[PDB]
Amino acid sequence: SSVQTAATSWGTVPSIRVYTANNGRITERCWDGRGWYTGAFNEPGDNVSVTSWLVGSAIHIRVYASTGTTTTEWCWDGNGWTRGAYTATN
Ligand SMILES: Cc1c(C)c2c3c4c1OP(=O)(O)Oc1c(C)c(C)c5c(c1C4)Cc1c(c(c(C)c(C)c1OP(=O)(O)O5)OP(=O)(O)O2)C3
Ligand SMILES: Cc1c(C)c2c3c4c1OP(=O)(O)Oc1c(C)c(C)c5c(c1C4)Cc1c(c(c(C)c(C)c1OP(=O)(O)O5)OP(=O)(O)O2)C3
Ligand SMILES: OC[C@@]1(O)OC[C@@H](O)[C@@H](O)[C@@H]1O
Ligand SMILES: OC[C@@]1(O)OC[C@@H](O)[C@@H](O)[C@@H]1O
Numbered sequence: 001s002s003v004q005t006a007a008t009s010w011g012t013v014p015s016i017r018v019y020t021a022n023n024g025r026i027t028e029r030c031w032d033g034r035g036w037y038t039g040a041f042n043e044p045g046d047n048v049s050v051t052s053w054l055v056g057s058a059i060h061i062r063v064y065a066s067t068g069t070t071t072t073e074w075c076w077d078g079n080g081w082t083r084g085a086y087t088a089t090n
């Protein structure tokens with residue numbers, strides 16, 4: 001009935017990323033100080049969570065995308081989104 005979001009931020013500008021699961025697809029909206037724009041993330045999922053951390057000034061983002069009982073981790077480390085090693089307890 002309602003879309004599901006996850007958000008993360010870094011720095012003091014700040015940079016913000018908001019991930020929205022709608023219709024089985026997760027997309028990404030970005031804020032870097034001058035208006036919201038669309039980011040490169042696009043993966044299947046009904047539910048989403050996110051966390052991020054800085055190494056110096058480089059951001060690292062991990063998005064956990066779930067469909068059914070399957071969760072896939074997606075990794076941003078500065079040069080494209082790549083599948084992570086995450087698997088669940090099951
Ligand atoms: C795709 C999808 C998601 C992501 C859902 C739900 C449903 C869902 O299937 P959908 O095709 O929408 O079928 C439904 C329809 C047509 C109606 C009228 C429903 C529900 C669903 C079931 C139950 C439902 C759900 C909710 C929430 C917050 C409410 C209020 C809520 O009651 P309400 O809106 O009165 O009743 O959780 P949420 O939307 O996050 O999860 C559960
Ligand atoms: C009107 C306007 C233009 C046409 C600019 C720039 C700025 C600008 O002023 P404004 O946007 O008000 O203030 C800024 C704000 C609020 C932020 C957060 C800025 C920048 C500016 C400065 C710096 C900046 C500029 C860039 C580019 C490509 C980047 C990535 C870029 O770093 P960004 O992460 O955005 O940081 O060049 P651009 O051709 O856009 O030139 C330079
Ligand atoms: O500048 C936008 C961008 O490169 O920021 C890092 C990640 O959020 C990417 O998905 C996104 O496209
Ligand atoms: O560099 C990617 C990676 O090693 O980063 C740390 C964890 O997110 C791992 O699952 C992931 O594969």
